């Protein structure tokens, strides 16, 4: 199972359900209490997250999955004046 994430830029990225389950909100969307359109299933839509940012946090979506049962190294994502600012509200908006 996997889900697709769209950025306000137009880029698209799909992460396995469990891989996307690291968002806390993307997993609830796969079946959220909403109507069902003839199409658009297991997908995510961020009107406030660029493609480079949805992929940045997404890396932790998969890194956290194999690190949830590790507890030994768990490094830290690089942050600088160029990328990370959008993750402020986007990274936090995607639960943990």
């Amino acid at each position: 199972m996997y889900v697709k994430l769209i950025s306000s830029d137009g880029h698209e990225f799909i992460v396995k359900r469990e891989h996307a389950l690291t968002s806390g909100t993307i997993k609830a969307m796969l079946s959220g209490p909403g109507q069902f359109a003839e199409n658009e299933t297991n997908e995510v839509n961020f009107r406030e997250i660029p493609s480079h940012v949805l992929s940045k946090v997404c890396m932790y979506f998969t890194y956290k999955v194999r690190y949830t049962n590790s507890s030994t190294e768990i490094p830290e994502f690089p942050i600088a004046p160029e990328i990370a600012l959008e993750l402020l509200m986007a990274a936090n908006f995607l639960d943990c």
């Binding site: 932790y60 942050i79 600088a80 402020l88 990274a91």
Partner: peptide, 15 residues
């Protein structure tokens, strides 16, 4: 392991 929400605060909190 934490999501990107915590890593993003590292720069805003320190940087």
């Amino acid at each position: 392991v934490a999501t990107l929400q915590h890593l993003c605060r590292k720069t805003v909190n320190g940087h």
